[PDB]
Amino acid sequence: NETHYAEAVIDNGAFGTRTIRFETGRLARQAAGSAVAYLDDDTMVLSATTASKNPKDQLDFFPLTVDVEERMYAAGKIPGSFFRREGRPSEDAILTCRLIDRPLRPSFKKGLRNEIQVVATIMALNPDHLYDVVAINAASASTQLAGLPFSGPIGGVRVALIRGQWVAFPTHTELEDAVFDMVVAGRVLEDGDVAIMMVEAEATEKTIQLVKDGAEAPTEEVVAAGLDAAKPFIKVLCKAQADLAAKAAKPTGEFPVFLDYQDDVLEALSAAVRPELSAALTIAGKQDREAELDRVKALAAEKLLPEFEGREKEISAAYRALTKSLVRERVIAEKKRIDGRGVTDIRTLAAEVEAIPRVHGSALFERGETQILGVTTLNMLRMEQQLDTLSPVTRKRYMHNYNFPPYSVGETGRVGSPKRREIGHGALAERAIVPVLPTREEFPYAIRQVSEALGSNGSTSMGSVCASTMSLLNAGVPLKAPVAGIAMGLISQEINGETHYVALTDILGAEDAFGDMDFKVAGTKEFVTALQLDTKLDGIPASVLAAALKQARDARLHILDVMMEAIDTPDEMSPNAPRIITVNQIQEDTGAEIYIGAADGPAAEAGSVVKTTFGAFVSLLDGLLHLGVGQKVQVEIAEIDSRGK
Template sequence: MEGQDVKSAAVTIDNGKFGKREIRFETGRLARQAAGTAVVYLDDETMLLSATTASKSPKDQFDFFPLTVDVEERMYAVGKIPGSFFRREGRPSEDAILTCRLIDRPLRPSFIKGLRNEVQIVVTVMALDQNHMYDVIAINAASMSTQLAGLPFSGPIGGVRIALIDGQWVAFPNHSDLENAVFDMVVAGRIAGDDVAIMMVEAEATVKSAIFERGETQILGITTLNMLKMEQQLDTLNPEDHKRYMHNYNFPPYSTGETGRVGSPKRREIGHGALAERALLPVLPGRQEFPYAIRQVSEALGSNGSTSMGSVCASTLSLLNAGVPLKAPVAGIAMGLISDDVDGKVEYVALTDILGAEDAFGDMDFKVAGTKDFVTALQLDTKLDGIPASVLSAALLQAKEARLAILKVMNEAIDRPDDMNPLAPRIISIKIPVDQIGAVIGPKGKVINQIQEETGAEISIEDDGTIFIGATNGTAADAAKAAILSIADPKLPEIGERYNGTIVKLATFGAFVNLLPGKDGLLHISQIRKMHGGKRIENLEDVMNVGDKVEVEIGEIDPKGKLSLIPVLDESQKSDTASE
């Protein structure tokens, strides 16, 4: 993004023992077709984009100021794939709605009285440290984008959350800080001469991305990876019942400098997302090679040309940045056509990389996506009764030249899959006999839940016995793998083997100790006495509890495979037992 007029400013707030907070403001890089835009960072981990647009003419029929504030929470901000059925963001959360109100309160009275132009502020949460509170950052972002929009606005408005913790005032406290706060307040206001005008008081990841820009079209691509169990489940007339690669396309109204509805995707957004998805599906690695659910989001931050083909390019860059081993990079280009009657003969001129006006006034919108060797997706819309095959053939060749030029530039940015995000799960796979799936799952999921809880790994089981194990560190994945294999491909226990077991049940005659998932043994009360100097024990609850860890050794295995355990005693316990 060379040559852009990007301006930024930062302020650091020192909260003493509670650490420093850096708030950084930036404009001129993203969503430049909105009347005013601002990107605000908190500690370089939380990022909010605010865009303000206004209608060109007033709505004189209104007797109120038509200001709309929308807050869009993106799940990729915290490295997650949405858990909803459609694996896509839906209605705004309660937090988002309350943040909208928090922004509206101080900003609304700052506009000139009598203004009737529609004004829309859209704040998008694009990255978030989940310990950060983004609502007050959103006030500052919305104020800055509105100030830059050139509207009759008496800002800027500054917002701060302040909390009293251990006798100290802390600015922009985290969620964890507020656990010990005795006072929590949000204040927003502006400087009026030498005084401060208070406008409002209220008391009380995993992800990789890339930006592709061509002319005024600007696309932000974000890739989120997760376990296969997070793939989208389909309930349609189509026989396909799941979707591993999910491509969502968002086209906010500020991308063309307009106001409009935000929220659920419109038909155009669904269609553009589907076209970009079709373009990339042929180059994605298979499930066995790359066992991840992949959610790709294309945010159209600016539009004057084909945002769907821009989405293909941005997605390729983002997927490679996320470490997805694509078979080949994919780029897309939109071709146009102008035709006219010249001396009684229709002549055609193909246009490469059409702008919005050329799309509107031209005779064809021909979108072509592909690698350097193959076309992966096509879409043709025309206003003519038909287009000669020779004209289409020439347009395809012209599109290839442009596609290769774009791929060359993309290759200079990233030419191979990057390292995966450290927060993305590392997934290993194993195969077990199908008849052992039930044993691994256990009654009502007891066994698999126990393995996940004890190891910290996530486990997904396929119908053919393939098991995918995901964890952010290799130790947890290996521990889960060992636990599964001990059930599905058990090694017969041998006398003398030692385990650090967990007490799972107490009885009058002893304690049952879990050695491995699905494998328990009995530590008889006579053996428990040895752990306590041979003293008589009236009630086992007096000396041990369910959940306690105990080191034991297999002392005996009966013909039915039942295990009798003996405790592993330290030297002091041995001497106490001997003296008894």
């Protein structure tokens, strides 16, 4: 019963040095594994990992559960909730579970059915620090000590490109000059190289201005450079955890493994339908393929019976392994996809605005079976969301909600509270847009964007980005630039001692499951505003990654053109929306928080840019100059026309 420590020294040169200190042996001694992670001995996150004794063999998936508990006392604050007790998880808490779960899930031995829970509690937070990345490491650390079939440690780091330097674990203060904010997690291979496993990045609300003022825009080259910059830190973080584990990790336990199917089922099934299956997979038609792809299942589920009775699940599971094998192989050799597309072909696109009546703005975006409806709502800033969490953010001007109803995929199910993925995809698409939004002063409105995943089969979050851009422009939001997104995939298998890679454009839901890496990129025509990535591959050639990002860029540009046809410049602000033209009695009669702010056009009406094609009509007592849909600008009278203009 002794306390052990280890440190990961983070050297940011001119920006200073900071340390991630790991501790174990003092707190929560009843957990399978426990560790504390401090950022400069100031911010503290405790992580406890536990495992249920009995496996849930009933499930066909590894049951991992990650929970992030924000304790408001870590900020010296008493919860503002009515009951003065922290309750339902904030966005940050949920997004952090995702950041931890993504790289930790695939790190456990396959077939594991025991419930593994990881609880990270934020106990102290310096208001200038970001706890998410401190928590990733603490999560990995406690799990690594738990004596479970887990291949860690996993090192997590945030690198932001601040003034030309990729700073590790930047502070909120340092992020004010960041053109790109990127979280990365990975492991250290037996040969010392770092394998990146997870990436969640974004451009910022500062990017455009900073690039204007001289900084380098976050293009694919820059972003890829950032990924390399994160590796040394991840190695340092991993080495520190390994030193802790070396001193106090429990010995790996003996856990039951649950296979999806035995060999006799696969050999049987393979021998029974392999030919018909590999053939059916060559049908470039939807209903035709699925049809023959059905005859086969039949010829199989009928040829293996009654020999294999009560093993039906193994049959369909083996049917999946075989299909996957066949589909992957065809991509590497024939470079043809399960739907007949080439490795860089995008699915049938359809963009459109004015899809719903009355709403301030709306757009419909379809790509294959993915159909997203985006709807925009503009209100007074008083409607902006108010937050009281561990984040320094207290108000949110741009709000995105992503709904994924069951019938989106022809299913029945609960319709209500948003899942963790609905929060995850919603965030990415929200973050992909934020970089191009006008400022509070240029556009004094709270903006709520809702993406309805009416149809789903091909990256709805990315489709959501395209729908947001158009919907917003349709509503009159003076975006600095349109943003589009694309979901990519990567197949990789070694053909006789040689590894080949094939990057896939706009991957189907199936190609995600059969791929070795899936990454999503969104951005304007100039730079990347968002990037998400996941993979278990032991690193990939720089030439390959860069090639994948470039391919993704191309797709993104093509889409931006299609979107451009739908709408280019912002449309006029809906009459049904509010205006804040600058120029009790009538404040409660004319209806408007009189600088005038009306909740309807027929108010303030019957200097601030009241309208900006051949100039800018700035409000006065308005004027015209041969600003946005609400921007501010010092006005001076140059000439009074005959009519009095």
